[PDB]
Amino acid sequence: ERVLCLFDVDGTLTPARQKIDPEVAAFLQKLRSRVQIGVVGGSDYCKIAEQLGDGDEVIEKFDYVFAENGTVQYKHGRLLSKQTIQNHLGEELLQDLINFCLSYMALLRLPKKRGTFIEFRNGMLNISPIGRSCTLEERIEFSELDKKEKIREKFVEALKTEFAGKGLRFSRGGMISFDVFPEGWDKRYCLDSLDQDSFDTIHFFGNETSPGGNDFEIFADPRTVGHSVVSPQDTVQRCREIFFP
Numbered sequence: 001e002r003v004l005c006l007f008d009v010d011g012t013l014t015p016a017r018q019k020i021d022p023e024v025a026a027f028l029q030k031l032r033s034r035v036q037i038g039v040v041g042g043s044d045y046c047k048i049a050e051q052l053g054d055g056d057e058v059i060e061k062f063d064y065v066f067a068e069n070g071t072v073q074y075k076h077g078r079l080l081s082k083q084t085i086q087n088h089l090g091e092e093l094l095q096d097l098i099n100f101c102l103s104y105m106a107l108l109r110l111p112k113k114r115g116t117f118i119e120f121r122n123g124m125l126n127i128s129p130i131g132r133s134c135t136l137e138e139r140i141e142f143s144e145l146d147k148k149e150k151i152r153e154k155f156v157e158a159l160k161t162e163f164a165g166k167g168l169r170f171s172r173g174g175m176i177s178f179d180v181f182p183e184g185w186d187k188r189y190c191l192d193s194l195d196q197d198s199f200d201t202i203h204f205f206g207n208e209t210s211p212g213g214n215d216f217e218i219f220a221d222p223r224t225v226g227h228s229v230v231s232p233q234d235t236v237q238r239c240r241e242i243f244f245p
Ligand SMILES: O=c1[nH]cnc2c1ncn2[C@@H]1O[C@H](COP(=O)(O)O)[C@@H](O)[C@H]1O
Pocket: 042, 043, 126, 171, 172, 173, 174, 175, 176, 177, 178, 179, 214
């Protein structure tokens, strides 16, 4: 009788990068009367909290908050100790990756460069040829050039070949950047901790559950009952069907 409903955020509970619709938020608390609820998203905690409430409301509204794919975890209001990428990969491979990226970017000539070309996060390194500290206009300008020249795509091809067999994965999306993360540090990462919390059933809901999507792995994992949704309204409807028939 112990059930967790675990939700992707962008396009599953909220419009992408935007605040949750109050009506959806209301349903989630209603659902909470029957099951525990949780979110897992690739973004950092600050971004997730921003979309799901004011201040740190998110950690009171949800029983679990998994940011950066679960490498950061809040469980019933309490922050757990974080996993760092350097402990998993080791300093030598991490620095090999960093230096390859620095060397590669040094040779790229762009309309503009700024700063934060390599952002060190808990769950990944984010690599941006223009640099993350660029304005909106600068970002769009880079993006247009990127599509014409396949700048990020070529960089990722070179990276994958160089590190073949070494257990690194690379994101396929993004606008001015791409993600580098250890194999298994997709959304499945949060499942290891959840394994210990005595749930009879964990239902996962996501809008990117086809191959290539950032929900595919957690959706397909045998530890979850998987649900594919197309919008927050679809998500609410699915939960109504299953939990309030
Ligand atoms: O494949 C993707 N799917 C979802 N998010 C991504 C993907 N690739 C990068 N991101 C994240 O999306 C955010 C915004 O991307 P940006 O437009 O390149 O800054 C960054 O924090 C990235 O880590």
